[model samples]
Target: HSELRKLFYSADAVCFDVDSTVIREEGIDELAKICGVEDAVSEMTRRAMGGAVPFKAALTERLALIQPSREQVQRLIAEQPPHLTPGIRELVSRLQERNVQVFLISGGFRSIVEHVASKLNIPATNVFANRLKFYFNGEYAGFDETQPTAESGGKGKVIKLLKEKFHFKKIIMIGDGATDMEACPPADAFIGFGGNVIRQQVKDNAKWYITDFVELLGELE
Candidate 1:
């Protein structure tokens, strides 16, 4: 237990799951509400987070139901900006001040994730998220299916790539889902966050779990 804490405090990098971890709500779910497909898309999101369905398939079905236009996405973000979870801004700033690299990895859209990143002062280059495509006419053209975050086990894949690219000795991944827990083989450790929502599987399995970012912030001190 102490060893894990030591590794966490000294981690060379930390990867955060954007939806429901860094932010107070899921980006897709918010978009679904705007598209009037909230119930259907929310169910798919639940299954995907629980590992009951393939991440890519869930993502596909959800987006199909929404089929949001470029204008809609832009308006959605502008009119209803994402709400950062409590203490996250401080936590991220503290991590950066400590010289620990912070990355946002999510199955959410790049456009929205970038917004969240910019608020935290994280560069766009440090974000790994699914890209949404649009037609020349600014219509919905589906998402880029090639993104690693578009599929199951993709988070771990991204972690592996980050390790290779950065040569980080110890990296920690924090989120509130099964996907985050699975990323730890590539991530040196996993910490579960439940400030927004909690998953039983993650809570039961996480070596370290907290419902508030203040717990994490205190750890840094």
Candidate 2:
């Protein structure tokens, strides 16, 4: 609680990564299952995360393989059960009471992100992520390749944009990913969340590593 209190009270803005940070599973994985290509798509996801391939290229190829309809994607997202880390809702509600601004940034698609943002009471525009496109035949075309988050350095780019827009005195980023690690050096405080999923690089570089959101609340004061 001490650690969370120290950081939270000092931060003017809090930025979070959505998939696996706020939720338990990757959004694309859920979509893949709906399209009946979970096995094949999971491999591509692994490669992209492991740096064996570019995220954009991998995402495009995976989407093409799935050929999911827009309706299918929406249904998958709608059926998603919130996989929030224990105490996350309490932590977020407390932060909202303190008048802290929250933002959800991710490499996941907009369908899932919008649902998450709404559930968390975060404004729609405050969520930044890749947008999925559909072909005229109702098949998945690809993601919005123009989004910075579709590639590397995307997290950093989003952070810079948010800082410029909000003009906050302090910025804090919390997540568990290579992309999240990229934002650490620039952020006022970078807290690594290892409760849902732990990454070695992220744990190594984080300013503070917490296994639970309850632990994060300890740092706030």
Candidate 3:
């Protein structure tokens, strides 16, 4: 039952959530700390994840407070490199070895997300996230209004696109957020990852729950 049962179910592609799922930190909240609005930004994030607010609403409000300049964005990329959740690097490496496509699906900004993709050799095409914009003076502007994941139930939309493109016979999603679970046909396995943070909604509903990636590797082996 603790198996990588999804492999048995289907998975020509595996989509991963970034903030708090693939990485040990939340990029937006951490950026807000440097911007001196950590509390305000964090509250919005908390409300969104708690399902009390729309993801797009929370995203817009938090970005307004942070308004991170391009220099600060570069500093975040340099000083706060993504710390992988337990066994992520290992899992990613193994997935590559098996020739399985790994997609980094996140509501986080593209500036931070690209680094993870580069580190893993996942191509730009497989990276689905919001793009942060800046003025000619490097001041923060906002994100692309057209991206689906910028709002609630957006991950499902993204999954639908990926499903169409990849034509995957079996696809799976792994993350700690309710948003990640929105992947239908519901992630074939929808393995809830609690390697760093755990959401009860995800925990209660996941077809499988894993606190350590080793458990997943164990079942796969």
Candidate 4:
């Protein structure tokens, strides 16, 4: 834990998982509930988070089930804006203030996360997530499969790319999913966040498991 604390002191890049890590709610599940497909979407979410199912398969299946309009996709966030987890804004702000580049890496939709990040003053270019494609008439076409976050090991892939591009010596990943924990190959450290939700595997494997930003700030101090 001491090493983990010291790691933050020299870390060059810090990435956060969107849904459970920074936000109090899951964006897809929230959309699924309002779209009347909560049961199916939530089940896939549970399986994916539990590492029982591949993230790509779960994402595709859930998107197929939702079949929402383009407007619906765009307005979902406005209709029910995600509530930010306590202290995340300060964390990001503090990190950016210290010249640590902050990235929001999530399996959630880019449209949704970009908004949340923008609200926190995180540049949209630093936001990475899957994009939901729509037809000319605003009908659901499909998801952009080209994104790294759309497949398994995608978070790690994103980390690797970021590392190569920026050549950072130390990068930390903070999230709550199996993918987040698996990002260690490219991430120097993985911190499990359980403010809103917790997975046993993530908690057990995380170098540091934290329930609040205050705890993280204390360690950084």
The most accurate candidate by TM-score is 1
Listed per model in order, the count of residue pairs whose N, CA or C atoms clash below 3 Å is 0, 17, 2, 0
Could you tell me how far off, in angstroms, the CA of residue 194 lies in candidate 3 after the best superposition?
0.6
TM-score of 4: 0.94
TM-score of each: 0.95, 0.91, 0.93, 0.94
> Best candidate per lDDT, number?
1
Relative to the unseen true structure, what is the C-alpha lDDT of residue 203 in candidate 3, on a scale of 0 to 100? 84
lDDT of 2 at 163: 77
lDDT of 2: 0.79
* lDDT tens readout by residue for model 2, 58-127: 8788888887788897788667545766777777777788898888888888778888888788888888
Which parts of model 3 have CA positions greater than 4 angstroms off? 5-10, 219-221
lDDT by residue (1-221, candidate 3, tens digit) is 33464453356778898989888888888788767899988877887884456788789888998999998989888987768787888888778777888989888888888888887788888888998999999999899979977877777788888777767777788888877776755455577888898788888877778888777674454
Which runs of model 1 end up more than 4 angstroms from their true locations?
A: 1-5, 219-221
> Compared with the true structure, what per-residue lDDT tens digits does model 4 show for residues 128-209?
8999888899988988888999988888889998988998888999988778888987898888888887777888877788
Candidates in order have lDDT scores of: 0.89, 0.79, 0.80, 0.84
For candidate 1, the 10 contiguous residues with the lowest summed lDDT are: 1-10
